[PDB]
């Protein structure tokens, strides 16, 4: 049906033009649903044609917006799911396989059904991720503790508001200069009585000597444990490393991207310079170069822990989690 075509085109233009789903969870949910509708409302005899069309759709979606990595993550997860289902109904690279050792043209009828059910489980796991990070609040926050967070993150907000119903601590929010979204999080935290404080980015280091723990979130996580966070987060990580302050990252499993930090000159998202320098400045705008990057790169050695729906892990283990979610042939997509 052409309804799927209209849906795909509308989603592509919604990603390419502006912001659609304003939360990573809803973005992943609609991505999974659109991939399920593509799987159902299409004719594919074998798994090869289905994998090819899914790869083409994911490629065009990532071409619509390269920074929105959640769509590509969901596409690669669906591809991996199809791969397990095909391998199960039929009958990673390591040293053991290199010492003790394939095409998808075969056809199966019920296979598609199975795949659907598999997608189904992933769907439910979504509505757990947030709370699966929140329920681990009291295990990482003790009473009378100073905590600093940057920007607006729903996961960190839920973490703090769940750790505050039984403990009482100090929270400091540093608003980002281009997009001052820390004020909204500060108001939402003060509405629950958590003794929240608001500050700018320039003071992040100034008060860093009086902070016991830093808890942040991110847009996506790279394969080596690095981070693609909001701008100003690398400075926060450097300040936490200077004072040996532990840095905790709240991120679900759908924010893991198999890509490595080798796509420079496009890693950061550049927006109009109106946010940094206004248009009413005058004739100086013709000789001044203004750049407003939205995201920035955070190295893995500046991170202490990763909290996800499966629990607490170290960055030096992220390489394993990727291998448990995506296939090495779907990294380039």
């Amino acid at each position: 049906g052409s309804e799927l075509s209209e849906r795909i085109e509308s989603f592509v233009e919604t990603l390419k033009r502006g912001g659609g789903p304003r939360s990573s969870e809803e973005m992943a949910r609609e991505t999974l649903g659109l991939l399920r509708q593509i799987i159902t409302d299409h004719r594919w005899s074998n798994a090869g044609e289905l994998m090819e069309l899914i790869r083409r759709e994911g490629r065009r979606m990532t071409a619509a917006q390269p920074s929105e990595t959640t769509v590509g993550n969901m596409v690669r997860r669906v591809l991996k799911i199809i791969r397990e289902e095909y391998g199960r109904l039929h009958g990673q690279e390591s040293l053991h396989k290199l010492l003790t050792s394939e095409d998808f043209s075969f056809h199966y009828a019920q296979l598609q059904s199975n795949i659907i059910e598999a997608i189904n489980e992933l769907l439910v796991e979504l509505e757990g991720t947030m709370e699966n990070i929140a329920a681990q609040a009291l295990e990482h926050i003790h009473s009378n503790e100073v905590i600093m967070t940057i920007g607006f993150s729903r996961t960190v907000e839920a973490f703090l508001k769940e750790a505050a119903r039984k403990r009482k601590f100090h929270v400091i929010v540093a608003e980002c200069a281009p997009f001052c979204q820390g004020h909204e999080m500060a108001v939402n935290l003060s509405k629950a009585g958590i003794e929240t404080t608001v500050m700018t980015d320039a003071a992040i280091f100034a008060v860093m000597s009086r902070v016991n723990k830093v808890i942040i979130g991110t847009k996506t996580i790279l394969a080596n444990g690095a981070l693609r966070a909001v701008t100003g987060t690398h400075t926060l990580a450097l300040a936490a490393k200077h004072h040996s302050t532990p840095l905790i990252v709240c991120a679900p499993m759908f924010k893991l991207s198999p890509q490595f930090p080798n796509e420079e000159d496009s890693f950061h998202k550049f927006v109009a310079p109106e946010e940094v320098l206004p248009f009413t400045e005058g004739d100086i705008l013709e000789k001044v170069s203004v750049h407003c990057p939205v995201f920035d790169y955070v190295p893995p050695e500046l991170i202490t822990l990763f909290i996800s729906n499966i629990g607490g892990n170290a960055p030096s283990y992220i390489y394993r989690l990727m291998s448990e979610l995506y296939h090495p042939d779907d990294h380039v997509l």
């Binding site: 532990p246 629990g311 607490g312 892990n313 170290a314 394993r320």
Partner: protein, 353 residues
Amino acid sequence: VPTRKDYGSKVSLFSHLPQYSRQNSLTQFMSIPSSVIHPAMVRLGLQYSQGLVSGSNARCIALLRALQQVIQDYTTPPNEELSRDLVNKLKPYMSFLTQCRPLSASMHNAIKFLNKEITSVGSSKREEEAKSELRAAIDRYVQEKIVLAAQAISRFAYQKISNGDVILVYGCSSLVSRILQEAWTEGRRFRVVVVDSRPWLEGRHTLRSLVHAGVPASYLLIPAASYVLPEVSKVLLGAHALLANGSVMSRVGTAQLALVARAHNVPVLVCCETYKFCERVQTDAFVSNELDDPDDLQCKRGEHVALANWQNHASLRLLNLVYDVTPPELVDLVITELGMIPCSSVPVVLRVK
């Protein structure tokens, strides 16, 4: 079972941890012939409270023996299945043991393994057969998780000890003492520097254990560790638990020793078995620790005791920590029964088994 009462004023930073007194106990409000709690469990809890069993593997062995005795004295009621009934019955015992003394990581792992073994019991299995199989499984666990797991670690740590080495140990550890004794018996010639700390002073348990073996040993306190480290070749430390993030949870004087050893270019070695590996993580000794009896910090220096009556002063707090956490960057080598693996391979061992 009445809950144990708190003693003294706790520190504000550690106000979320229970602080008990060794003098008072719960057995005052229980039956002399124990009915709700098993008599073996009551004896084990009393020994844990009085400090008669103050180790890590010894506590696990005592708990497993008490559980074997309880299973032997267990009788399944009618209309009930053993798989659920035994699990529901063993829960108040663990609650009482935790009330006596906070459980260790080895005890938690043993409890989890026993609960899994009991839940994995078939329905058609007879009662006596199931009890005997559970006892045999506990015996095999004790054999291949503590006894057989120590010989492999002793054999792996033998090739890391050379003639003329100066090994620095801390506190009392069964694995470290066994490794040193076996290395001296094999033919290695070295000397050990024993480090101790107040108020337990359990390092003397190792010192007199080396003199009886023939190893030349020295003795000093933890504030004088930076003085003897320039002459130390390597540092052997014991571990109570290895967290899933690589951090080492051990006696409070472990992370400090590992930090001071780094400033002197002394390699730090950690010895631990694979059954003490925890899937949980921890970044500091504030989120999870144990507050011992604060009256143990009192010492008689000269004629009087400065902390004789510390409860009279309102703003005076006495902190007596038990455990601490060492970051993975301060640990160089971790010796297990599977081999000499780095401190970052803790989740891998947690994933294989």
